[PDB]
Structure formats: structure tokens, C-alpha cells
Subunit: 234 residues, 5 copies
């Protein structure tokens, strides 16, 4: 019996049942709105037709009549459909939550340097953070967010390594990044910063955080002010 | 209570309630289209006339056949409708062009010029992004939400024996996006290791931008052209 | 009006409404086949035996099944009859439809010598019941989407990748890049896709290359055919042919 | 007749027959809950300038009210649905046979260690070029709310391809389902002798086993570790 | 008219229609088994101060589902089809060496071959088998080409092979056997099949025998030239 609770969950039998009951309840519902409003009032009172075919066309005539009846039934339905549409196009637009994703592996915490330049430009940016150990483990992560919490765009916060060989990891992670993106439309902002881009510790420090902002920057534009970059089109 | 408004939204209880009820209206409708038309009169056709002791399968057989015709006729009608729709793909919808904030020479225009010319009937849309490495989730957005049945990929690569990865990196996301949804996004790359000075680069850049757009027209309306070109 | 009509489009509600109605037609349809043909014929208990009066007697009271069995077994008989017809129909469906049309051969705008024809020739020869669709493209880095559609939005149970890569130790990348698409292509859908690459480094002059290009397309087509029909040929061919 | 068994299998007519019947049982269930609980108390005892009018409208509101009941019931069923015992859960580790050091246990130790209620699950395979379908399955057909990439690399300038290859798929596998597949690679070109490799190995084995624990329950930790240090390894 | 027979197929309208009707049949049946059959013989706390009744009946149905699941589980188990795919570009038939060793480790492994001509192709095929026949695994016994340029192919194919697996929960045993691992013909030949069998070997295991591999652990097992210890 203690294995039984597994089928309900993996299969989630409850979710389907409910969703339809609102199907039946949610549709039987929208119906009387047209059945008991929309129609009797917006249709009462309102062809002169004799012709050249028959009577097997009287079949055609009967057909025409039926069509008209349906139309009375059906165009009302169409109208109701239209009415529903207007609400759905109503909602909220571009004043959303941007989440930023980070590395324990990397050296120079850049979660802030950006979180700042961004909250600044716009206070109403409910931010969300999540961290992973490996440069190569942000992906699942960033998506999860893009998939389960608006996170309507994100930043790739972290640093790569040294030596000729570790060049692979960047390529590799990035492929999966682009992918995460494509698996769901929403640019995940790659915030990469290779270490071989300095000559000491201090030099690199500046380089990261400075960068870490310029992007939290473009985040704004690709969020609320498109034209700008449009203009920044060298 | 201010919590309930959340369930209704996440699950979208309305989107289903509508779509299903529409079905009944949308099915009941077309039904009489045959129940009361193509049947009551197209009937004097094919009694058919005259397979496998004590014996009503037949009279029923005829009825079954009629129903098949009505069903088969419905299928035919559906096919016709599809074709009609598909004529809509004889008629056009539009180009799409995506641009960088990383580029050094704005192709965008050089291109848009050679596109409205060869064909005025082309309602262009522009959308930009910062990094080479992004184009895709965008390239895909247009193509996923807005028509744009083709899209020029406007961008410029970098230098150094090390920034050749970007090209490889991005190109894949491209075909990916491509193969994500049947749309030929022409990669409009222009590496910076293809010159000696500034002016030289410039000419090379915009010049190409056209050659592709050039083709963009072709892939659109004039396949044969490319056809003969082969090879 | 117009706006609404646009609204109607895009989502493809029509698809549902059609298929939806269709089920009703299709269902009510096959039913008639049983309600009046398969069943009003299949109903003597006989022949066949082995029903049960497994000492129905004083229990004091164990029964529930006998009646149920009778009624049930009676419904099973009807369901069972229906099932058989379905299988028969399926059998007919399989065995009948070798009627087949379409190969599909996509080409370059990049390449220097037209293969397509070289390949097309041998193809219809190997069998003239092949419906060929040629469709070209400009950059070698394109075919993918294309081949894809040919395999998705038309039958083309296969296709040829007649194409031509470039020179220089740098344009080697393209081949790689493209091949992948090709796979993604292939992998996106269960239709093999010969890759008709040839690189331009495989020679010392113009004429040499020319022979080489066409020579292959043919070879390929060759397999196309078996690959379409003659799996047995190749079956043996392992180990160098 | 020995051919019939095929149809029943290929189309799986049983699964539907069950799920379908289940729906009826599952729906009537949720119904009685409203029809007989949420309503028979939670809601009881609580001229026109006319035309078609005031009986029409009045019936419209009643018909609307019934929908509210249904909505309430739906809410109730959703609510009962718990966030209970999420996090706890099962780990599971995958291993190699193309490998040279059994890391498997190394981490296994550190793990049950920091937390005893972590039923672990093992399974293995031949080379590196495979693990994927494995991990996937696990992460897919059992909880394994994450898992590790326990496996060994290789040495010649050519076998480098292996990591690249497998991994691209790790990321896919991960992408393909929102779970962390912790990559536990240990390149053999990171040593000068046998014993040397050995340590670096099992040592690294614990270094992420550790991160599993955090990533499972301890999130804030990695948060804070943030930008600072921790290259899980040498 | 000669165009419609296409639609019925691409969509396979009938298979559904059938399955659909069967559902009603398949369901109504089991019903009588409970409505009519299991029930008529049969007949949490507090606050002083029908839903339970409904739940009782509902509960009863639930059990039936698990019984049915068990029943389904009884008819066939981890004892079937392999179905190897092989090369045509190949320099030596690998298929036989493992096909042999396979039937050995046990006869209950209906083998189902097939081949193709270019090394890159397989993927689709390999996929196809896994998907449209219960090849609950498969090999691929490839072979690559020479020169320091063709190496690309192996990568290319493999990643696809890789998705192949990824698209479907079934172990693809790539079997790549490069030709830069020899000095002459005969040498390579050996390396070749030899390796083939070894993989077959694991294949017996990966299917039924999982403990075997478990123990191997980090211990040696380096299929190839000369098994390299732990
Ligand atoms: C997309 C929204 C759907 C919500 C869930 C209800 C699914 C509607 C499917 O209809 C069913 O389709 C079958 C296929 O033809 C028919 O056999 C059957 O008669 C019909 O009932």
C-alpha cells in the first residue's frame, strides 16, 4: 500500500480530474451566459426568398435554413468567444522579476555589482538568486528558474579557469546555455569572465565587477527600453 | 481570497472552457453542413446496385457506405480547407532581421535596402541584442511569435585566434533554432580577420549583407533562380 | 472582424474542431459495422462449450459471478468481435500501401559541379516508381532546415544531401557544423539522410574533382535504393561489401 | 492467436482503460466532497423597468454562483496537495567500469554521514560514453532528485574528446529534466604517479558529495560561499 | 480522390478510432467485474458532535488498478530482444564475433540485425530500432576512417548516437574501432572483433547481470589493447 502513493504522484491523477471538472463546470458555465444572456435579448425581431431551384433544392432550402439557425446559435457563440478574448489580452506587462544565477567555483562575487546597477535603474525589479558549484552546472539551474518563476531573462554569473585546456568548459557550458534559452524563449545573459584576461589579482577584480554591471545594464534595455540598443546598432 | 486569483491564472481554466465549448458549437455547425446538404441531395447518386440461407446487413451496408461518404466527404472538405489555408503560404507573411550591439558596421540597413527594392510587398521587423551569442532565443522568438518566415542573421565576429569559438558556438544555436522550427535563418556573419584596415572591412561588410538579402528574396519567391544557379 | 479572424488563425483551433467532429463520424461508423453486421451474426452460444454449473448448490451463499459471467461473457463476446474486425482492418492497411512516392534531393548554390542530375539519373533507373522533389538553397549551412521540411512537410521517406564543402584549413568547420544539423535533422525524425559531402581538397586540378564529385552521388543513390528497398543487399555487404 | 498479443501491447489499451475508468471514480470523488460538504452549510442560509429581464438576470447570477462552489472545491483539493517531505529524499550515484579508482564509496560515506535519511541508489556501466541514458533513466524513473557523474577520464591528447562528448549530453540530460547531474570527472593527466592520482581522486569524490548535501538542503551556504574560493579539487 | 488515401495514413485516423472504441469496451468490461462481480457478496476521528461511503467505494477501485498493474507486469520480463546494427563502410564484419558470444551467455536473446553505408547514418537507424521494436538496447559496431581529419566523424556520430540514447531510455553501445590502432591489416583485425565481443559481454550484463559490473567498480576493465588494471 505504501508503494501505491507513488502512482498518484508520478502520474498525478488528481491534477487531471480537477482540471476537467472545471472543464465541465467552467464550460457549462460560460454557456448559460450566452444561453441566458447574449442571445434572447441581442437577437429578437431582426430574407425574402423564393427562387429557381427545388424541390430537391427545397432540400437545399432546408439546408440554408439549418445553416442560418446554426449561425444564430453559432455567431452568438463566436461573439461570446470574442468577449472572452478581451479579458485574456488584459493582465500585466513589463514590470517583472529578473533572477541572477551564480558560481561557488568562481573567484569574484558579481551577484551585487549587477544587482545594484539594476535595482537602481528600476526599483520594481523583484530579484531572485540561486547558486551552483560548477561553471558547468548553472544551465539546468537558470532554466529551472526560467521554467518555474517568471525569471523573465537571467544572467550567467561566474568565472572560467586558466590553462590552454579549460577553454573547453566555456564552449561546453555555453552550448547548453544557448540551449536552455532555446528550450524556452528568453535570453539567458551569459556573464562570463575568463581569468587569463589579467596580469594579477587586482587587475582581474576590476574587470569582472565592471563587466558584471554593463550587462545588468543591457538587462534593463532588453527589459523595458528596446529602442536604445536599437539605436546602439559600432 | 486574494490567493485564489492565482490558481485561475497559472492553470488557465478559461482557455480550456472556451476551446471545448467552441468545439461543440464548431462541430454541431459543420455537421448539418452534411446532415442537411451534401447528403439530402447528393443522395440520388450511387445506390451502387449490387461478398463472403437464413439471413438486414445490406440495407445497413448501404447506410454505412453513405455515412462513409458523409465522413469521407467531410475529410475531403477538411483537406480543401487546409489547401486554402496553405494558399496563404503562396501569399507571404514577412522577413525578419536581427541585430547586434557588438557589431562594428551596421549591415541592417545595407540589407533592408536590397529587400524592399526587389519586392515592396515585404513588411520588415527589426529587433536588436548586445551579444553575438544571443541572436537565437530572439531569432526563434520572431519565428515563434510573429510570422517572419525567414530572418537575416545580422552580426560581426571577433578577432584573435581565440574568438573563432564564438562562430562555432553561435552557429549551432542557429541551425538549432533553425531545426527548432522550419525556417531558413541565413547566418550573416562577417569575421574581422578578413581585412587589413578599417575601410577595407567596411566595404566587405555591407556588400555581403546585400548578397544574402539578395538570396533572401530568392528563397522567398524565386526558388528556380537559385535552382539554375546550382553549378 | 479582421482582427478576430487573425485571432482565429495562428492557434489552429480548426484542427481540433475537425478532428473532434471526425472522431464522432469515425466512431459511430465502425460501431454500425458491429451493431448490425459482426454481432447480429455472432450470436448462438454454440458451437463451443465449457460454461459453468460448477456444483451450484447450497452455499449457504456464494455467487455473484454466474449471472455476471453470463452477462459479462456476453459483453466480452461483443467487444471481442469488435476487436477482431479492428485487427483485420489494420492488417488490410499494412498489406496495401506499398503504393509509395517520394525521395527528395536537396542541392547547393555553393557547389561548383551539379551533382543532383548525376544522382537523379541512376535513381529512377534503379526504379522508375520514384517521385523526385528537387529544391535548392544558397549556403551549404542551410540545407538542414530544408532537408527537414522535405522530410516533414511532404513524404520523402529519405533524401540526398548533394552538397559541396570548401578549401583552406579553416572552412573545415562548416562541414562539422553542417553534418551536426544533418544528424539533428536525421535525429529529429526517423528518415535516414545520406550526406553527399565531398571536400575540394580531394584533388589537384579541376577535372579530377569533377570525376570524383559525380562518381559519388551515384554511389550514394545506389545505397539510397537498397536503403529504401534492398536492406538484404547491404545486410551481406558488411565487411567491405 | 499468438499474433494478437501484439496489438494489446503496441497500443497499450489497458493504460487508457484504467486511467479512463479512474477519471470517473476520481471525479465523482471530488464531487461528493462539494455536493455534500463544502456547500450544505458553507453557503446555505446566506417591479422591473423590465422587458425580458429580471428573472433572466436573476437566473444568470444563480448559475454563476454554482460555478463559485466548484471553484471553491477546486481550491480545496489543490490546497490539500502538500509540499510535505519534499527535500528529505533519495540521492543515487552512477559509476564506471572503464574506471581505475572506486570513488563510488568515497562520497557515499561523507553523505549518509552528514545525513542518515538519504537512501542511496547505485548502478553502473562500461565506459564513460553511456552514463547519460543511465542518469536520465534514474533521474526519470525513480526520484534521485539529483545524481552524480562518478566516472573516470583518460590520457592521450586524443581521449580528451571523451569529456567533451559525454558532458554535452550530461548538460542535455540535465536540460531534458530539471535536475542537477553533478559531473564528477577526474582526468588522469592530473598526476605524476599511481598513488598521486588515487588521492586527488577519492578526495575529489567527497568534495562534491559535500555539495550534493548542500544543494539538497543547505542552499544559503553556497549562497554565502558565493564568489569566494572553493575550486572543488586539488 | 487518389490523394486522400494519404491523409488517412499520415494521421492514422483509424488506429485511434479503434483504440478509442476499445477503451469504452475495455472499461465497461472491468466495470461489470466490480459493479456486477466483486461488490455484491460483501455487505479516522472525533466529533460527536456519505463522503466516507463514496471514498470507501472509490478506495476499493484503487486497489483493482494495482492488481491490474501486477497482472500486466506478469506477462513478460527482462528476457528479450537485442537487435544489433552494424557498418557497411567497415573493414571487417564485427557483427559475428559478439553475435556469437551473445547467444552463448544465453540463448533467450532474439537478435535482429540491419545495416547502412556511411558511419554517420546509423544514428537514425539505431534510434529507429530502439523506438519501433523493443530493442531494449543495441550495439553499433562502427569503424572510422584514416587521416588526422576524419577523426571529426567519430565525434559527430557519437554525439548523435548520444542524443539517440538521450531521446530514449536505452543504452546504445557505441562500438567505434579506429584504424590508427594498428600497424598492418591482421593486427587491427584482432583488435577489432576482440573488442566487439568484450562489449557484447557487458551487454549480457547491462541487461540482466548488474551486480557483475557493480563489483568491477573502479577495477581495471579497459576494453581494448590489454586490459588496464585498477
Ligand atoms: C485540446 C483540448 C481537449 C481537452 C481534453 C478533451 C480532449 C478532446 C478529445 O476528443 C476526443 O477525440 C477523440 C479522437 O478522435 C475522439 O475519438 C473522441 O470522440 C473525442 O471525445
Amino acid at each position: 500500500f505504501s508503494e501505491f502513493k507513488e502512482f498518484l504522484y508520478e502520474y498525478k491523477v488528481i491534477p487531471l480530474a480537477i482540471a476537467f471538472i472545471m472543464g465541465i463546470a467552467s464550460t457549462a458555465l460560460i454557456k448559460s451566459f450566452v444561453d441566458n444572456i447574449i442571445m434572447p435579448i441581442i437577437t429578437p425581431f431582426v430574407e425574402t426568398a423564393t427562387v429557381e431551384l427545388g424541390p430537391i433544392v427545397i432540400s437545399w432550402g432546408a439546408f440554408l435554413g439549418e445553416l442560418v439557425n446554426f449561425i444564430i446559435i453559432a455567431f452568438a457563440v463566436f461573439i461570446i468567444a470574442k468577449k472572452v478574448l478581451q479579458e485574456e489580452k488584459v493582465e500585466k506587462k513589463m514590470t517583472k522579476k529578473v533572477g541572477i544565477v551564480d558560481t561557488t567555483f568562481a573567484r569574484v562575487d558579481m551577484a551585487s555589482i549587477a544587482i545594484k546597477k539594476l535595482k537602481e535603474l528600476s526599483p520594481n525589479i523583484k530579484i531572485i538568486r540561486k547558486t551552483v558549484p560548477g561553471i558547468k552546472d548553472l544551465p539546468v539551474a537558470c532554466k529551472k528558474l526560467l521554467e518555474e518563476e517568471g525569471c523573465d531573462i537571467v544572467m550567467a554569473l561566474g568565472m572560467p579557469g586558466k590553462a590552454e585546456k579549460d577553454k573547453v568548459c566555456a564552449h561546453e557550458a555555453s552550448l547548453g546555455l544557448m540551449l536552455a534559452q532555446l528550450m524556452t524563449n528568453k535570453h539567458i545573459i551569459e556573464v562570463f569572465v575568463h581569468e587569463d584576461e589579467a596580469k594579477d589579482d587586482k587587475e582581474l577584480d576590476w574587470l569582472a565587477k565592471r563587466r558584471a554591471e554593463e550587462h545588468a545594464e543591457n538587462v534593463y534595455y532588453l527589459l523595458f527600453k528596446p529602442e536604445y540598443l536599437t539605436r546602439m546598432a559600432k
